[PDB]
Write a protein that binds this ligand. Sequence first.
Ligand SMILES: O=c1nc2n(c3cccc(Cl)c13)-c1cc(C3CCNCC3)ccc1C21CCCCC1
Ligand SMILES: [Zn+2]
Length: 118
Amino acid sequence: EKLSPNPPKLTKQMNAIIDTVINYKDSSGRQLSEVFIQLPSRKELPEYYELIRKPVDFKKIKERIRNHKYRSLGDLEKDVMLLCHNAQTFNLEGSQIYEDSIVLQSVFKSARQKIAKE
Ligand SMILES: O=c1nc2n(c3cccc(Cl)c13)-c1cc(C3CCNCC3)ccc1C21CCCCC1
Ligand SMILES: [Zn+2]
């Protein structure tokens, strides 16, 4: 089965996991994903592209689910962990963005364990 199409059930699970991550709010009602939806342009933040080898945003992850680029829930996981890794690489330790990216890793893993195990 190594090369085979993604079942509709799997694609639905992928979208539900990523929607849980994108929609996640703190107790104040702030949506943590907001800044991570779209990458900055190379004109507005050139130094991002000098430091980050493999840029990714949540828009691109949603596109990759739709175009069947993830072979597995593990491949989806790897791209979400890459996004969060890039945020921690570029942004200052202790910054809101840096901290938010750590919480989103946990939100992803919780959603995967709950949705795929139920
Ligand atoms: O790691 C990121 N740091 C950042 N971003 C990101 C956007 C998507 C994915 C990631 Cl993983 C990041 C990101 C995105 C923006 C967008 C650009 C288009 N207009 C909406 C805002 C602006 C600034 C950023 C930072 C955070 C703040 C400091 C500069 C860079
Ligand atoms: Zn399709």
